[PDB]
Amino acid sequence: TFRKSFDCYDFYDRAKVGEKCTQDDWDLMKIPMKAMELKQKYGLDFKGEFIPTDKDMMEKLFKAGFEMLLECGIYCTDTHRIVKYTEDEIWDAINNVQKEFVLGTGRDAVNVRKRSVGDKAKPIVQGGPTGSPISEDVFMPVHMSYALEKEVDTIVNGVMTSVRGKSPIPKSPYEVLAAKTETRLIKNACAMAGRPGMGVXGPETSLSAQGNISADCTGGMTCTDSHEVSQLNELKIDLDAISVIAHYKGNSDIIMDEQMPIFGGYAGGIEETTIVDVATHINAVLMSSASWHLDGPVHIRWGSTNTRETLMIAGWACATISEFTDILSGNQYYPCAGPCTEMCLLEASAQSITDTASGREILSGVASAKGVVTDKTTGMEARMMGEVARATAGVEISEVNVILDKLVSLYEKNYASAPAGKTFQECYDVKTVTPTEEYMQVYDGARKKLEDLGLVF
Amino acid sequence: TFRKSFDCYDFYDRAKVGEKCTQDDWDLMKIPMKAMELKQKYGLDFKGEFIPTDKDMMEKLFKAGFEMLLECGIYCTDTHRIVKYTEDEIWDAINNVQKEFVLGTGRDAVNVRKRSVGDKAKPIVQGGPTGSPISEDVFMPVHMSYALEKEVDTIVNGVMTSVRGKSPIPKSPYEVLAAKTETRLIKNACAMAGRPGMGVXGPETSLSAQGNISADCTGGMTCTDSHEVSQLNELKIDLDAISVIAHYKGNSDIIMDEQMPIFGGYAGGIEETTIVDVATHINAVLMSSASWHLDGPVHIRWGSTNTRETLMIAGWACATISEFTDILSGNQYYPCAGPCTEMCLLEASAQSITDTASGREILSGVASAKGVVTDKTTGMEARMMGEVARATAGVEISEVNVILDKLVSLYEKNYASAPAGKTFQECYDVKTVTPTEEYMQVYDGARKKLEDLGLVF
Amino acid sequence: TFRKSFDCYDFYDRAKVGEKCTQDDWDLMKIPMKAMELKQKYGLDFKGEFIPTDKDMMEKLFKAGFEMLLECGIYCTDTHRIVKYTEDEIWDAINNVQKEFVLGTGRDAVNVRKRSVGDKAKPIVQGGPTGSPISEDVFMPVHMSYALEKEVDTIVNGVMTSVRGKSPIPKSPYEVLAAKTETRLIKNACAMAGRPGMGVXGPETSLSAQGNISADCTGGMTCTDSHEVSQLNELKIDLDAISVIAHYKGNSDIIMDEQMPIFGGYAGGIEETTIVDVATHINAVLMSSASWHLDGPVHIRWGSTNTRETLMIAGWACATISEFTDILSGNQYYPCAGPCTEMCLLEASAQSITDTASGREILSGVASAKGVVTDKTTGMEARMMGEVARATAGVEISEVNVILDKLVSLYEKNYASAPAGKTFQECYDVKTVTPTEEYMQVYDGARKKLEDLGLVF
Amino acid sequence: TFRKSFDCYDFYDRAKVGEKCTQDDWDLMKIPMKAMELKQKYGLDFKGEFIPTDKDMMEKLFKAGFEMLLECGIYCTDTHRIVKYTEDEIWDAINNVQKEFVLGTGRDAVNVRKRSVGDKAKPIVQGGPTGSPISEDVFMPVHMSYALEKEVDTIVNGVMTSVRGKSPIPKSPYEVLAAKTETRLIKNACAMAGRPGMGVXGPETSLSAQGNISADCTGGMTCTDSHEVSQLNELKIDLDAISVIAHYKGNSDIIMDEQMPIFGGYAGGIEETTIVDVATHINAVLMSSASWHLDGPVHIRWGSTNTRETLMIAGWACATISEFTDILSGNQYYPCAGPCTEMCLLEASAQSITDTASGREILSGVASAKGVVTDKTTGMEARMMGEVARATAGVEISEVNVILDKLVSLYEKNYASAPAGKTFQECYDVKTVTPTEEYMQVYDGARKKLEDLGLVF
């Protein structure tokens, strides 16, 4: 049996004395070799499906992911050593996950409970700039554009490009100021939208351990919000995250561990990256004591989470995690196109369909324009994400796979020419925080195409 | 109809003017006569089953328990008088029980909802010294050994053998100090384990009404913890408990009424003691306004809750209560053997199998070494209790009965020679609060035997 | 030096092994002998003054009181043994008393800071039924009559003659219900008077340790209220109080220790009883860890706190305690006459003059009709107590002594014929909670007589 | 005029673009040159006095300290640049300091208000291990030894040598665990001493910014506790502290900035080091937005704060700061000798006399054995610190200077042979947390010598 339930403290202990290994030996050899080995040994073949209908193949994928984690372990960047788990420790973690939890407070709180593949229940819609850079002078209005949408249940924080007119440089006092201020301003925006108790997910502006740890404060982040800790790529972590985890646990905070496996990255192709994905879902409840895990498969070239490959990775990982474990999870949205464009909405829609049908409990989006363009994120994208989730709930998986194949084909040849889109200030009336007629028309166009494919809103 | 929903105040009123009766007339005549009468009138025969599969027999057991309570009433030790209920008052209590509730706070909180016989859902694992005497210098470490186990959901408090180096003598200021300190220290231990909001069950060190009433305090017991009030043996209560109940109700505290029927005691044999058990489950929601009831059938000779007879009593009482009422309940663990012994683990395992399959919502253990030996309780026993509960969930009752018959036969001939076991200090590294290799090996041995019997972990 | 700062735990320890002594040996020998001895050794003679102007005599009184406590100790009724203190332990207690504290919350909170003899600052006016029996159907209105008076700063709780129509018999669940309900209802009355945060002093309806300990609750008594623990007569205590003290300390509650020395009681005459009074003021911060001490010298025959002798005892004790220590204190009011009578108002006025000029920080009244007649207490008596306190503040002590001599002579020949007075229902419009014209006229008459004596309102 | 009131954000801004300077150029040239220059220009000569009686010399010392800060600025270690203030910015900071504040909660809270030189009011006694290393298994008992002393008002945290049996290595998760656990355990110890609301000062076990920032938590440090940020030597700071300051400010935490000027260090001798001391008292309210400043002049060779020179530095700095500003402050205690020795008590006594008479509001001690020896700190040292403070309050400064000269001469020739003393476990009964007869006798011996010198307890 195991000595004790594994936690961040055991991780630190092992990271200091584990097998010495260069990061290249990990990225260019150990990881790709194991993913390749397990794919062939289990004969994994997704056969073009976005969401699996072959439970035998799903079980083999689960075993592969478990074995990937067990045989490889986790690479610690700071100590350049490998941390290994025992089979019993992994099962103790999987056998004792958080069953459910509540986000937000008062009338605005929402319950997060497990969803099954093809579940009639609608997932939680976590809308927001999704870590995208937002100008300080419109930080509240931008977030209010999400709170004003009934489709949105919780908020995923954007990043302040400045606080008191200064850049929140990591390890500077401005980073601490931003960490606390970020959620304080966002909850104030929610209150202005008549929803003071909406839960949020962050912190996002801070990057260092000290900055992230300073985020919990009065009026700011509290135990009813999702606290983010990020795993690295692939099956890797830094000590900063380990200390942040200890902090979240010590404050009784709901913990959201995230990991964005890279298709075409160190793991390899579709099945290979999915094995890594399953492994990181498991690592979340083991290393990070996560309450829930946020996935986000991204294309090495396009940097989007809604390409055919990344959608298949997410669909299979989630359906498998949903079938063999009670781990709560979500997926994050990074479309290529920017706001106020039909492509952006169709991209997010494809992912919403995939996430909803595959069993995700939470949809966290939308980081339009790949989340790297200042002010290019608005509540309209989250509205579509939510409406599409409702349209997808309860639909037969066979039908969903057909719809996805048709939808993805509508934009997958235009990644390189994805429209830049517009900023919040350009497609919204900033004063009243309402979308322009231009955006409403674009929205209708996208919705019509989705209906032509078979979706019923 | 009834005048008003019955409560502790009505009990006091009636206890002062009820039928005068000596305690011997109650214990040696009224109780045994009625149990004997109802057993024969309803033709109760459990036919060797630990968990019933005959719903007709179960219904007769329910009617017998109801009638036992209705015809006998409750004996008040302080006034030496009998309190009687009306049929309508009993039904009003049964028809309006607490449907569900939450224990603990923040990320660490857990929901307690009704379970059915053979339910696939796993019961709540309430681990702790279970009222056993624990040395003051290791009070926190011992409790931390339970909080560190992911298998454990809430903590059941141990008893401080001293506070500030002094015995917490009843009605002395030290009893009050211990009542408040007990949970304050335990929640601090939970926080050190990264679970600040774990719910607890107590108070345990205090014995008088004034001591028990002083337990609610800042940093200590709060409304999200289970508050214990104890019924006496059999269908009996003292006025101290009645005042404690008034206090719990006045503080909006979750109330856990407990009663440990004695097999071979005043009621008589198996079926007779089970009739009393059902009667006390009902009395819990009537007299104590209980949120949930904690059972604990104990063998008059062995003083354990896991003998063949006591397991049958618990299994039938719970399955019947689960079938005909919505009363939430649990069972407490008192093995003969001490920690770090195979027998102790097998004893607790037999009870976990029984409690899980019979429909218990909460498992409260483990009071190893019969809970009377200082420092002889560790988190390892609770880990087994939890893992066995998971293994049992969803298993066909017919199969469970077969497994139990085989398992109990493995130790039921060794009660008189049950191994003393070791203390926490002997089978754990007190500094890191981790089990020794010795214990881990003993644990594996017990687990292997359970697997050979058919349990799948 | 001392081993540790003395507390209730040390008291319990010593009470179990101290010198065995019958209560008669204590009351009829040890106490009267020591008081007699110290009076003569220090040549104490108050020479008719209500408030001392001879600092040398005051210092001798202080030394006598200290020595009374040091040489006698405290008799524990439950163990029939004597607890002794060391000189160093007593000084550690006197040298480290609570400097100040706040009562109540929000806008309604008030600061309690030390007052000197003849201080221009007005003492805190704690108005209420002062433990008098109040009918359940008018419990809120009666207390509201005090909250409606701007003269009143905090409330001193009355006693519920019934709760839910039943007597709150000690050690019955009704006592617990009353303990919590008492303050809940009173604070609701304060809220109706537009002062939701007024602090209170209690609990009063409960008498047992378990009842008193149950008083702290949501909506009821909290740390910003004065928590009462009562010393016995004379230099005596029971273990119930010792446990209650442990409870108050464990909840960070402001503690008000009270002791009502009896003139003509076991101690003897005026100077003798004052020596005991000083000794009990000191015992308050030693045995009870008091935040402040409530005095209340009472006449053995008349049962009032405002006779010439009891006023002199209070005046000298307080002036001396104020001169040589920083112990915060107050005095309680028990007039012979009932409400709506001129005598009642004059009696309370004499005490208010004495308490204010002698240095009391808090005036707790008024228990009209000796506090033993149902519903015979109203806010009008507290209004007079407060207005007279303002009139007295800053007045030269020589002048105060002259006024007191004249005032007390106005009623001291009528103790046996003191008017019964009327109930709240008879001298107030219960619906609007306002005094009748009858009472207002009686009030004016008393006020006029006080003005003729020299008081300026 | 100034652009804006100066804060940590302005400091960061300036630290990035200020004058480049090597640390040697700062320590070996800029600082010593300016201190030397200002000492001579103002003709500073303390003429052997511990506490000044020459207000003209005091005013010159104030001007020198102000000018030291204005002309030198502050060296930032991380950027190797100098931050400069303007005269107007410094005055804005000095002209707007925190007037007063409250530490702790409930009955246990205490007010901190300004004291003058020779004030009759007693300073706040902040007792504790004072950052000394304390074994995990006695962490609570050791701190309880301070809470049990009525002389002690607040607690100054010790350092956990281990948490869950592991060293709290900086930037490891154990550091975060210790940061939160430290105060949680200490407040639990205070509660066991019957003082749940005692305020504390920390965090102490953590050393990194992330560790310090994680200290605020439920059950742990809160806004009513003093939050420590440390300045470096001399007129120097690191960016970690700057971020910690931003965090404290963002949480509305009471901030305690500390700086321990080294006699014989970079500044030079007595007057030179005092100029630096005054400069750092001012820098506290400027750079750190301090609520109060903690001094601690230490001897370069002996490493103690109670040598003749360090006492003179503290006395002059405080008397001057008290005379010309309203800056609240305290001093920390580092005796050479260990617990249970007469020298240790006499050393701390000399400093208590100096701090009390010079105007300190808070006395933070005692770090016996120079605070570097595991478990060598007990409440007895704080008791002496407190009793001596009471004895000193109100005494004429001329008399205090005479007493100090005599007292310091009693031990100043024995620094090299200062007795090692004993651990808490050796001079206390760990179970009851009470001093041994051995310590009580040592205590009496020291007290007698202090009385022979003229102190009246």
- The type of residue at B268 is G
Residue carrying structure tokens 């008492």: C182
Q: Would you call C4 and D148 a contact, using CB atoms and an 8 Å cutoff?
A: yes
**Mutation site for C-interface testing, chosen from B171, B229, B237 by largest number of C Cβ within 10 Å:** B171
CA distances to B29, C371, D433 from D424, rounded to whole Å, are 61, 53, 9
C80: left (phi over 0), alpha (psi -120 to 50) or beta: left
Domain of A155 in residue numbering reads as: 1-457
Q: Which residues pair with B255 in a beta bridge?
A: B227
B-chain residues within 8 Å CB-CB of D196? 218-219
Tally of structural domains, chain D? 1
D-chain residues within 8 Å CB-CB of C251? 106, 196
**Mutation site for C-interface testing, chosen from B164, B229, B247 by largest number of C Cβ within 10 Å:** B247
Show the tokens assigned to D280: 């750092």
Question: Who contacts C440 (Cβ-Cβ below 8 Å, separation ≥6)?
Answer: none
Backbone angles phi, psi at A397, to 5 degrees: -60, -40
CA distance A282 to chain B (A): 15
Q: Exposed, middle or buried: residue A88 (CB in 10 Å: 0-12, 13-18, 19+)?
A: middle
DSSP codes, B354-387: HHHHHT-SEEEE---GGG-STT---HHHHHHHHH
Q: Is the peptide bond before D182 cis (omega within 30 degrees of 0)?
A: no
Backbone angles phi, psi at D262, to 5 degrees: -100, 115
- The type of residue at A269 is G
Chain D: residues touching A (Cβ < 8 Å): 8-9, 11-13, 164, 166, 171-177, 180-181, 208-211, 213-214, 216-218, 239-240, 242-243, 245-247, 250-252
Q: Exposed, middle or buried: residue A402 (CB in 10 Å: 0-12, 13-18, 19+)?
A: middle
| CB-nearest partner of A1 from B148, B195, B444 | B444
Q: Would you call D434 and C253 a contact, using CB atoms and an 8 Å cutoff?
A: no
Q: Exposed, middle or buried: residue A220 (CB in 10 Å: 0-12, 13-18, 19+)?
A: buried
Residue carrying structure tokens 């249970």: D340
**Dist. CA A372–CA A133, nearest whole Å:** 7
Q: Would you call C98 and D106 a contact, using CB atoms and an 8 Å cutoff?
A: no
| CB-nearest partner of A5 from B148, B390, B443 | B148
CA distances to C73, C75, C235, C284, C312 from C69, rounded to whole Å, are 5, 11, 8, 11, 21
- CA D435, D437, D441, D442 dihedral sign is negative
Q: Would you call A177 and D210 a contact, using CB atoms and an 8 Å cutoff?
A: no
Q: Which residues pair with D294 in a beta bridge?
A: D258, D330
CA distance D184 to chain C (A): 16
A-chain residues within 8 Å CB-CB of B149? 4-5
Asked whether C116 and C359 are in contact (CB, 8 A), the reply is yes
Show the tokens assigned to D294: 């903690």
User: Nearest-CA neighbor of D100 among D331, D364, D327?
Assistant: D327
Q: Is the peptide bond before B117 cis (omega within 30 degrees of 0)?
A: no
User: Nearest-CA neighbor of D28 among D303, D261, D263, D267?
Assistant: D267
User: In angstroms, how far apart are the furthest CA atoms of chain C?
Assistant: 63
Chain B: residues touching A (Cβ < 8 Å): 105-108, 110-111, 148-151, 191, 194-197, 383, 386-387, 390, 433-435, 440, 443-444, 447
A254: left (phi over 0), alpha (psi -120 to 50) or beta: beta
| CB-nearest partner of C171 from B164, B171, B239 | B239
User: Nearest-CA neighbor of B38 among B64, B62, B56?
Assistant: B64
| CB-nearest partner of B191 from D136, D184, D432 | D184
| CB-nearest partner of C172 from B213, B214, B243 | B243
Q: Which residues pair with D159 in a beta bridge?
A: D133
Instruction: Tell me the three-class secondary structure of C289-325, residue by residue.
Output: CCCEEEECCEECCCCCCCCHHHHHHHHHHHHHHHHHC
Backbone angles phi, psi at A44, to 5 degrees: -70, 125
**Dist. CA D63–CA A302, nearest whole Å:** 65
Q: Which residue in chain A has the smallest CA separation from B148?
A: A5
Q: Which residue in chain C has the smallest CA separation from D151?
A: C96
Backbone angles phi, psi at D230, to 5 degrees: -110, 130
Asked whether B156 and B365 are in contact (CB, 8 A), the reply is yes
Packing angle, helices B342-358 and B379-392, rounded to 10: 40
Task: Give me the torsion for CA of C115, C116, C121, C125, rounded to 10°.
Answer: 50
User: Nearest-CA neighbor of C294 among C307, C278, C283, C281?
Assistant: C281
User: Nearest-CA neighbor of D387 among D363, D411, D370, D405?
Assistant: D363
Alpha helix (H) residue ranges in C393-421: 397-409
Which CATH number do you get for residue A393?
3.20.20.460
- CA A390, A391, A395, A399 dihedral sign is negative
A-D C-beta contacts closer than 8 Å: 101
- The type of residue at C311 is L
**Dist. CA B77–CA B82, nearest whole Å:** 9
User: Nearest-CA neighbor of B175 among B196, B158, B161, B188?
Assistant: B161
User: Nearest-CA neighbor of A93 among B334, B149, C100?
Assistant: B149
**Dist. CA C100–CA A191, nearest whole Å:** 40
How is residue B389 annotated by DSSP? H
Q: Are strands D101-103 and D110-112 parallel, antiparallel or unpaired?
A: antiparallel
Q: How many CB atoms lie within 10 A of CB C167?
A: 13
Question: Who contacts C449 (Cβ-Cβ below 8 Å, separation ≥6)?
Answer: C342, C346, C410
SS3 label, residue B446? helix
CA distances to B250, C314, D111 from C41, rounded to whole Å, are 55, 21, 41
Show the tokens assigned to D322: 């008290």
Q: Do chains A and C touch (3 or more CB pairs under 8 A)?
A: no
CA distances to A252, B56, B418, D31 from A242, rounded to whole Å, are 16, 57, 44, 41
- CA A301, A302, A304, A310 dihedral sign is negative
Question: Who contacts A270 (Cβ-Cβ below 8 Å, separation ≥6)?
Answer: A46, A263, A309, A312, A313
User: Nearest-CA neighbor of C55 among C120, C98, C116?
Assistant: C116
Asked whether C227 and C255 are in contact (CB, 8 A), the reply is yes
Helix H or strand E segment including B177: helix B173-192
Alpha helix (H) residue ranges in D136-292: 139-147, 173-192, 209-213, 239-250, 270-287
SS3 label, residue B130? coil
Asked whether C283 and C74 are in contact (CB, 8 A), the reply is yes
**Dist. CA A281–CA B419, nearest whole Å:** 43
CA angle, B360 then B366 then B370, to 5°: 115
Show the tokens assigned to B313: 């009593």
**Dist. CA A231–CA A208, nearest whole Å:** 14
Q: Would you call A255 and B107 a contact, using CB atoms and an 8 Å cutoff?
A: yes
User: Length of chain D in residues, anyone?
Assistant: 457
Backbone angles phi, psi at C45, to 5 degrees: -150, 110
**Mutation site for D-interface testing, chosen from B105, B107, B137, B198 by largest number of D Cβ within 10 Å:** B137
Chain C: residues touching D (Cβ < 8 Å): 1, 3-5, 7-8, 92-93, 95-96, 98-101, 223, 246, 249-255, 289, 291
Asked whether B40 and B275 are in contact (CB, 8 A), the reply is no
DSSP codes, C127-183: ES-TT-EE-GGGHHHHHHHHHT-TT--EEE--EES-BTTB---TTSHHHHHHHHHHH
Question: Who contacts A404 (Cβ-Cβ below 8 Å, separation ≥6)?
Answer: A50, A51, A311, A350, A353, A354
Q: Would you call C5 and D149 a contact, using CB atoms and an 8 Å cutoff?
A: yes
**Dist. CA C279–CA C327, nearest whole Å:** 12
D-chain residues within 8 Å CB-CB of C8? 194
- The resolution in Å comes to 1.7
- The type of residue at D291 is S
Asked whether A341 and A442 are in contact (CB, 8 A), the reply is yes
SS3 label, residue B157? coil
**Dist. CA B118–CA B355, nearest whole Å:** 10
SS3 label, residue C340? coil
CA distance D133 to chain B (A): 17
User: Nearest-CA neighbor of B307 among B267, B268, B356, B343?
Assistant: B343
**Dist. CA B358–CA B296, nearest whole Å:** 14
Q: How many CB atoms lie within 10 A of CB B437?
A: 10
Q: How many alpha carbons lie under 13 Å from residue C29 in its C-beta half-sphere?
A: 6
Helix H or strand E segment including A94: helix A87-94
**Dist. CA D164–CA B429, nearest whole Å:** 11
Asked whether B237 and B207 are in contact (CB, 8 A), the reply is no
Q: Would you call D106 and C246 a contact, using CB atoms and an 8 Å cutoff?
A: no
- The distance in angstroms from the start CA to the end CA of chain D is 51
SS3 label, residue B72? helix
User: Nearest-CA neighbor of C54 among C38, C269, C305, C62?
Assistant: C62
**Dist. CA A5–CA A286, nearest whole Å:** 9
**Dist. CA D136–CA A178, nearest whole Å:** 36
Q: Which residue in chain D has the smallest CA separation from A172?
A: D243
Encode burial over D168-196: b for 16+ CB neighbours within 10 A, e otherwise.
beebbbbbbbbbbbbbbbbbbbbbbbbbb
In whole angstroms, what separates CA B243 from the centre of its chain?
Answer: 21
